[PDB]
Design a protein around this nucleic acid. Structure first.
Ligand SMILES: [Mg+2]
Ligand SMILES: [Mg+2]
Ligand SMILES: [Mg+2]
Ligand SMILES: [Mg+2]
Ligand SMILES: [Mg+2]
Ligand SMILES: [Mg+2]
Ligand SMILES: [Mg+2]
Ligand SMILES: [Mg+2]
Ligand SMILES: [Mg+2]
Ligand SMILES: [Mg+2]
Ligand SMILES: [Mg+2]
Ligand SMILES: [Mg+2]
Ligand SMILES: [Mg+2]
Ligand SMILES: [Mg+2]
Ligand SMILES: [Mg+2]
Ligand SMILES: [Mg+2]
Ligand SMILES: [Mg+2]
Ligand SMILES: [Mg+2]
Ligand SMILES: [Mg+2]
Ligand SMILES: [Mg+2]
Ligand SMILES: [Mg+2]
Ligand SMILES: [Mg+2]
Ligand SMILES: [Mg+2]
Ligand SMILES: [Mg+2]
Ligand SMILES: [Mg+2]
Ligand SMILES: [Mg+2]
Ligand SMILES: [Mg+2]
Ligand SMILES: [Mg+2]
Ligand SMILES: [Mg+2]
Ligand SMILES: [Mg+2]
Ligand SMILES: [Mg+2]
Ligand SMILES: [Mg+2]
Ligand SMILES: [Mg+2]
Ligand SMILES: [Mg+2]
Ligand SMILES: [Mg+2]
Ligand SMILES: [Mg+2]
Ligand SMILES: [Mg+2]
Ligand SMILES: [Mg+2]
Ligand SMILES: [Mg+2]
Ligand SMILES: [Mg+2]
Ligand SMILES: [Mg+2]
Ligand SMILES: [Mg+2]
Ligand SMILES: [Mg+2]
Ligand SMILES: [Mg+2]
Ligand SMILES: [Mg+2]
Ligand SMILES: [Mg+2]
Ligand SMILES: [Mg+2]
Ligand SMILES: [Mg+2]
Ligand SMILES: [Mg+2]
Ligand SMILES: [Mg+2]
Ligand SMILES: [Mg+2]
Ligand SMILES: [Mg+2]
Ligand SMILES: [Mg+2]
Lengths: 271, 93, 46
RNA sequence: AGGACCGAACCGACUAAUGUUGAAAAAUUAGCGGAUGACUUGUGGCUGGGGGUGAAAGGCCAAUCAAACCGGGAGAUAGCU
RNA sequence: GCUCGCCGGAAGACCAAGGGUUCCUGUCCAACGUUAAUCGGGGCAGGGUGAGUCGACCCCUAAGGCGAGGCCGAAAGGCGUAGUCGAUGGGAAACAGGUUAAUAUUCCUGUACUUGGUGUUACUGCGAAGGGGGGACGGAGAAGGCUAUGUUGGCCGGGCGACGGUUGUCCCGGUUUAAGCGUGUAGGCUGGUUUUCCAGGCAAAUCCGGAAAAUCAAGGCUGAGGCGUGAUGACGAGGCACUACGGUGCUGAAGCAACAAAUGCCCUGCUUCCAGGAAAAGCCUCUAAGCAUCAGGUAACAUCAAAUCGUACCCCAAACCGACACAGGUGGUCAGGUAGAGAAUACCAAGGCGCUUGAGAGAACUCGGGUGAAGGAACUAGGCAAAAUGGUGCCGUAACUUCGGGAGAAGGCACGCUGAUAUGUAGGUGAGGUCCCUCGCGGAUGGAGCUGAAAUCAGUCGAAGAUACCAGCUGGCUGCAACUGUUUAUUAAAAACACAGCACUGUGCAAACACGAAAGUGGACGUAUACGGUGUGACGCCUGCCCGGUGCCGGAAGGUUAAUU
């Protein structure tokens, strides 16, 4: 549910929270946790390579099963959980053989719901099948790009792909970007949309809420001196040049994709 | 078991001082200068062999040498090891 | 006011000590120069 | 509940006077701002010179910065004193 | 030595870091010490640091470093796997009393505990680099139970007062005791126990996980404190005897209760929130290979061992960082009384100090303060500076508003002491007694003693009762920036930067992009509700026309056009 905070202080006035009462209040399932320490956006040469990354809360990594290859064994959803490492929620599932795993939580999934993977699974949300076995027109998520590699497309809160066509060894997918892409029909997909679609209604409300998430401040190029940025300089607010990145490349319209290896799979660019 | 050659090198001298004199009279403890690399086990063995007494326990410490001016040139005395060797009650060295 | 030299013997040794000098070609060239000059103290090690 | 309120420690540095061969190569005194947070602090680590780092002042990078310091090319060159 | 003054959340005490003999004793006064110096952190000599349980070393990992092979690179080298290092974190165990001129949880006395090796006895399925559990983890909040600690009474010892009074509802001092061992308490968490089966836990598993039955209603784990014991001991106000008057020798009474009470402990708890909160070992457990009446494991007993290095001294400072015996800087720990909301403030305790030039004088002027007739901003670029306001309770409070605010708006009244209500109230605490008891660190009733606000009435002193210290000036119109934040270390704190929000644009994952001759790495163990760039800058109402110029995007007929031939 989406709740507006009352304006008892100026930093609360514009806050909008996404509050989900279904989520587990306790700690996560410890056997499926690992550490993930932070980078500050610094590579192994120690230099900043991605700007504006730093601080925020400590986070444990939850091992999520994107492969969904434990075929023929039913699983029951034990609970939905908050995962700090991503926009979607996750679901702890218990397989009939006693194994527990985390998966992405689809829209509509609740505790007690049964799921299954493989060629002979039912067409039901949370079930995973090869896209050869999924009807054309279906909405899916967590779509593999290569058979066996694990889901890479449509993982974020509220996302999904549509299977628009089937042509021999390939299916055509419409992605959230609007791109039409071919993928091998052997690739797996999970039926349904990713849950937590209200994620995009949140309003952070104050500067510190972005700092909690490990985003550091952006300084505008035009606020700088010429030595620092192409936009830098001027006595007063001045500009008078074509907008560029800090490294001098045009940043308003100039296309940057250059991958002749994967061009064959792209039926239609997002436009 | 320690070789007798080793035991004949570990004890260097008795230490004379008011603290040492009081240690002997009140606590039946002899104070010795010992080899820098001497262990409590070697000191105990050497005392029992060479002084022919029975040793209760050995406590040891390293004394750091003083920095001293000889004329103008600066010099430093050597570090050395001191042993407080407690004898059994009626030994009487 | 807080001045520039804030001593730490661990940091001193790790930054400028004998083993740090020996770990690289350029460090070994420091030692070579200082030996050639005839320095009494090659490094900060003590 | 809160980058909520008053206010010590703690962090800062708005005003004034003193000091200006100083008590001090940036402080003292009286007042001043924040004070559960985008807070503050200890230890250790990483980023290196057309390079870093910068909530951006050309700021900071050992009392040095519109290109650090040390050695070298080197007795640079100086229609100038 | 006697007085006086100063600090006392420190100007006292204990550490880390850093220093390294500055520590203690004797001796010296040339130089050093902003003067003198018999003194000294000065010179000279001698002494002084005692550990199975403190700390390091050691075992274990974090960030990160190094890295066999490897991949990559003119060379030098870069990156990284297996590994191996790396604490600021996890991992066994000791307390009280005494003692030196100078160390002490290290020495002595008393009383404990831990780990490991041997050996004896009894029983026995033992075994890992592998599996599982544990270790193992956030912020905020509330309340209860406690203790440290303090106050009062009692008790014991001492006193009867330099000047009116002081045998008492009088004055001064003491009234201390650990770890361990036993007890398992306030309280917290969890349903137990037994069989059968199993696509899981890189193979196995009696372990964990899952499924199904039967059966039982209490079973287990965690836990401050209290009490007992430790302890017929130790310590003890003082008193007595010496003194080489420096300090030793001898002896020791009481040693209880109530009430108050932490920011410490129960608490790694409980409640709640979103921003969702290390790892690895020690530890427990399961088995593999293998051993298989052996080794090996468990329990009791005895014995041996527990090395090495640090331990002096300063440590908000004359010993560290600042050239100085320098108004500077420097992390952690302890936290008495009265008053007070308080770690503020004033005055004190324990404890520590008077800041290493003095003596006079009492000019101008300078500095830091006090008070000021009448006037009251007339001063000045400018109320700069100063003066003023200042507490608690209660009454009362406007425009405007995003309905929270504005607000402590503004403004006003009360406030001391004594007595009474009530020889100390409401409230808190709760002894004895009594009753019960699934019987104890138990439940009910009971109210002694103790503690103790606030209010009202009456009186009373002063010029003045929030008496000192401490402690908002207030209001009106307006520009700018929404706001809290950030900034030119050392002349600029702002209207500048940032910000939540908005938009454009790139990016389909071996992503764009950035660092890098490369290998790689960040982006991200993310995947278009995501990530990068650029501009604008909460919110409200909005955001008009121009594609000629310069850029970018799409186009692919034609013109022109490279290497090549
Ligand atoms: Mg993240
Ligand atoms: Mg932005
Ligand atoms: Mg600028
Ligand atoms: Mg440029
Ligand atoms: Mg202009
Ligand atoms: Mg113009
Ligand atoms: Mg001993
Ligand atoms: Mg605040
Ligand atoms: Mg404020
Ligand atoms: Mg400080
Ligand atoms: Mg300023
Ligand atoms: Mg001040
Ligand atoms: Mg405040
Ligand atoms: Mg400028
Ligand atoms: Mg500088
Ligand atoms: Mg240059
Ligand atoms: Mg030349
Ligand atoms: Mg020249
Ligand atoms: Mg005083
Ligand atoms: Mg004070
Ligand atoms: Mg000396
Ligand atoms: Mg001395
Ligand atoms: Mg003289
Ligand atoms: Mg003199
Ligand atoms: Mg001396
Ligand atoms: Mg020792
Ligand atoms: Mg490593
Ligand atoms: Mg190699
Ligand atoms: Mg490497
Ligand atoms: Mg290691
Ligand atoms: Mg440590
Ligand atoms: Mg001492
Ligand atoms: Mg008590
Ligand atoms: Mg506190
Ligand atoms: Mg000491
Ligand atoms: Mg002085
Ligand atoms: Mg000083
Ligand atoms: Mg005068
Ligand atoms: Mg004056
Ligand atoms: Mg005045
Ligand atoms: Mg006047
Ligand atoms: Mg007047
Ligand atoms: Mg007037
Ligand atoms: Mg005027
Ligand atoms: Mg005038
Ligand atoms: Mg003023
Ligand atoms: Mg004033
Ligand atoms: Mg105007
Ligand atoms: Mg502002
Ligand atoms: Mg600053
Ligand atoms: Mg400045
Ligand atoms: Mg990559
Ligand atoms: Mg702007």
């Amino acid at each position: 549910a989406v709740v507006k905070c009352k304006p008892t202080s100026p930093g609360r006035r514009h806050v909008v929270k996404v509050v989900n009462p279904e989520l587990h209040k306790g700690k996560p399932f410890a056997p499926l946790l690992e550490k993930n320490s932070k980078s500050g956006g610094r590579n192994n040469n120690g230099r900043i390579t991605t700007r504006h990354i730093g601080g925020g809360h400590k986070q444990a990594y939850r091992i999520v099963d994107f492969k969904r290859n434990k075929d023929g064994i039913p699983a029951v959803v034990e609970r939905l959980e908050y995962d700090p490492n991503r926009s979607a929620n996750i679901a702890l599932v218990l397989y009939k053989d006693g194994e527990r795993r985390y998966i992405l939580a689809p829209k509509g999934l609740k505790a007690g719901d049964q799921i299954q993977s493989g060629v002979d699974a039912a067409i039901k949300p949370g079930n995973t099948l090869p896209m050869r076995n999924i009807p054309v027109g279906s909405t899916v998520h967590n779509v593999e790009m290569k058979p066996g590699k694990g889901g890479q497309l449509a993982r974020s809160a509220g996302t999904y792909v549509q299977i628009v066509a089937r042509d021999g060894a390939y299916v055509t997918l419409r992605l959230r970007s609007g791109e039409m892409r071919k993928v091998e029909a052997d690739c797996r997909a999970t039926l349904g949309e990713v849950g937590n679609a209200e994620h995009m209604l949140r309003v952070l409300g104050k500067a510190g809420a972005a700092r909690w998430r490990g985003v550091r401040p952006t300084v505008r190029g035009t606020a700088m001196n010429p030595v620092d940025h192409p936009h830098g300089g001027g006595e007063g607010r001045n500009f008078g040049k074509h907008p560029v990145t800090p490294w001098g490349v045009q940043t308003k319209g100039k296309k940057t994709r250059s991958n002749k290896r994967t061009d064959k799979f792209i039926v239609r660019r997002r436009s | 078991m320690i070789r007798e050659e080793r035991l004949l090198k570990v004890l260097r001298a008795p230490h004379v001082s008011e603290k040492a004199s009081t240690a002997m009279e009140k606590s039946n403890t002899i104070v010795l200068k010992v080899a820098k690399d001497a262990t409590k086990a070697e000191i105990k063995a050497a005392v029992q062999k060479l002084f022919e007494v029975e040793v209760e326990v050995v406590n040891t410490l390293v004394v750091k040498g003083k920095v001293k001016r000889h004329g103008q040139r600066i010099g430093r005395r050597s570090d050395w090891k001191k042993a407080y060797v407690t004898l059994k009650e009626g030994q009487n060295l | 006011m807080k001045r520039t030299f804030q001593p730490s013997v661990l940091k001193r040794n790790r930054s400028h000590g004998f083993r740090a000098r020996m770990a690289t070609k350029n460090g070994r060239q420091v030692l070579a120069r200082r030996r050639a000059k005839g320095r009494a103290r090659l490094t900060v090690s003590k």
